[PDB]
Subunit: 329 residues, 3 copies
């Protein structure tokens, strides 16, 4: 009912952090035209997606401020995505996104279809969504967006999962102050990269289940490459996550998922939880780390918000049981 993490952080005009269209007008939508009518409307709306909505032609629609998009009756958006642009205060929950896969574009480099594309927007909660094999990104977060929680989603069979900050060339000061994102209790399943890949900002990645089997049926990237990456001086803390790679034969040949990655050209920072906050890694390469200061978590999310960490051994069952669309009441 309320987000945990960066989406919950209060501002002047959003005293309770992200609340979407709370207090607004309730509308049920059953077609792409109806959905787009209300996501592009001005004002508070709770937009209830009832069942399957097919976008033909495939396309993305804009979403303005103060919206809740909530699915019921196994809500599906098929061949459609949401661009949240120059906006704030949007909640998206309990919908299954599928149908952006373009078999003529197996590396997701032509069509640019993202299921959720957040551009210069802040206070956004993406929760209890299932995303299945899209084209380009599943949830991308760009152009100085900020204060995002991506929680309890299930991402399946998808290559480039979540890019946070799309350009090495953005303003170091401004970008360093944006891109504050929390990823927690997500079920990441047979995915390839960017979970998240973050430039500049701050990422708290906790209590997610990474179940990295192969992406079959397709060409392009069949084997999972890496989970979390920290680039362009980002501050990332990764704790209490459970990583399972793709097995003993491959690991013995020196081929294995990389749980955390430092990337450049200006290296990011990233630390791991330890002790009660440790991650677990099975069939993985050794995680890459780079602290801001020896013995300190590169990010202290307790400076920004409260949260409780589940013991890592409990994470698989909690995440399988709870994550993705069709589980919320």
């Amino acid at each position: 009912d309320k987000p945990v993490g960066f989406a919950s952080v209060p501002t002047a005009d959003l005293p309770e952090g992200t609340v979407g269209g709370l207090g607004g007008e309730i509308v049920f939508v059953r077609t792409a035209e109806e959905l787009e009518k209300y996501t592009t409307a001005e004002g508070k709306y709770v937009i209830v997606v009832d069942g399957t909505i097919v976008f033909e032609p495939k396309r993305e629609i804009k979403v303005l401020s103060d919206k809740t998009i909530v699915g019921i009756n196994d809500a599906k958006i098929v061949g459609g995505g949401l661009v949240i642009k120059d906006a704030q205060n949007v909640i998206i929950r309990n919908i299954h996104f599928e149908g952006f896969y373009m078999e003529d574009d197996p590396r997701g480099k032509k069509y640019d279809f993202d299921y959720i594309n957040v551009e210069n927007s802040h206070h956004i909660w993406i929760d209890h969504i299932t995303f299945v094999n899209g084209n380009d990104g599943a949830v991308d977060i760009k152009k100085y967006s900020n204060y995002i929680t991506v929680s309890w989603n299930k991402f399946v069979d998808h290559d480039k999962v979540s890019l946070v900050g799309s350009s090495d060339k953005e303003d170091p000061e401004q970008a360093g102050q944006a891109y504050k994102v929390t990823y927690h209790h997500n079920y990441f399943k047979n995915l390839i990269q960017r979970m998240p890949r973050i430039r500049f900002g701050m990422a708290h990645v906790f209590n997610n289940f990474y179940s990295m089997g192969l992406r079959t049926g397709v060409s392009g990237n069949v084997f999972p490459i890496y989970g979390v990456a920290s680039a362009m001086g980002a501050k990332v803390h990764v704790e209490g996550n459970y990583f399972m790679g793709y097995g003993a034969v491959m690991a013995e040949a020196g081929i294995a998922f990389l749980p955390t990655r430092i990337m450049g050209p200006v290296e990011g920072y990233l630390t791991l939880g330890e002790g009660d906050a440790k991650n677990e890694f099975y069939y993985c390469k050794e995680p890459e780390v780079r602290p801001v200061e020896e013995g300190k978590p590169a990010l202290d999310p307790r400076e920004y918000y409260d949260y409780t960490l589940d013991p890592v051994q409990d994470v698989p069952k909690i995440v399988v049981d709870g994550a993705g669309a069709g589980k919320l009441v």
Copy 2:
């Protein structure tokens, strides 16, 4: 109608070897409660499983001596397994086991669910069963069990297939005299390990078809590792089996299924058939062998029972055509 191999070996009270509930009372079961009522009953029963039986919650049920559990009408046990404990003389045939896979436990190390778990039991025939992707073991054989035939089953998409002897620390004399198991005419399909893995005892592995493709859709072990393993001084003979691994590209990179494996800490023994009893290996590593004495089969099953060996080139078609549930009349 009668087992071949170690299940058929006569004792004082079992003059015809394994016969299950022959002569006993015939009962049809259509629920988990009814099945458990009769598998835990004292006395002779022929228990006919008619159609699908779902176990919610998932769980294993005990089976006592002198039972036949036989499926009809595409019998399925879903999310349930059978523990045959401190017992003897049990036949299980023509049932499809599925539904023990636990996606929060991709290495099968938490829940401990076995489709068939044989503990301190002997004279057990497991025949014409299909087992699909369980949790821990498909057919495990533990705690000094003995005189088992596992024949004409189809095992599919499963990681840890059949463990025979669960502890390096069992009594060398006692364990050396137990765990006499014959595995024949099984269709082993996209499986990872232990086909069987045996400690201490004696394993005759003949005329099985190993079709080792990838286990997809899952994390953990995606690539088949090894077929038969002989550990703790076990005596294993492997003859007339057809092994097909997962292809030229992998084999050329030095990555390939290992058909037979010697394991420790006290090394087992294992020999191959040759000439008319040879195995065939395609896309495999060279099999590991270790004879008890130069030029002798580490086990001579003709000292214990009669059998006829199919020519290895005939094994794929015979096994595909005949193995698994839903083929017996």
Copy 3:
């Protein structure tokens, strides 16, 4: 409506090149017996396959000269193939072949079932067909066959795709003058080898989409090995084709699809298009080449027929949208 490439080349008795049963008698067939009645009939026939035709037992049927075999209503030939032998002037279009896979023969070396087997025949057009995981070949071209176009087909999940010339021991002069084959606008999807593999003759391979993901569910060859191969002094030109292999992890371990291959024992020749006729390669090894003469295309198809080359970047979408059965009107 008319072939492009070698099938269109005029002869004395075939002034318009391949036209199949144009002008002949139209017949609708709905059973394997009816189909075989007409493919083995003498004379001109347009044979319209309406819906699914199942061959039990699985088998191949002969097709004589001057035939059009054309599917409607999602036409399927299941467990059947066509042998075009000592014949000419045959068109096959808009049918889905499936059901030759033999799981007891994962390397396709026992049963010898080909979906289309062209023997000592010429002027054959194979167009808008979908072929799914057969046994041995999908389209083999043998025994001095000649003047073939294989265009706009979709080949899926199949190991040994198209062998052109089955013997190193055929007559160098005669074979050098036969096996003139054009492969264009085919969607090659999760296939293993021979796309085509050609001995002796001349192959023009243009504007095909190679989407080389894994062949899962099966043992044998799970990883795609190589696309086009030129053997026994064949003359092959490969231009405007788009190759996508199976990803970064494998490529970084030195494991990757080989787009073009020179094979012996007498090496073939093969050249690539460049500039406006270039191919694209992603996640592939470097293509093998061997020109007849420095700076010349090993084959100049403009000496034999006219064609227009699509820009390679357009090929994936054109081929996905247009290739395979069920798309022709």
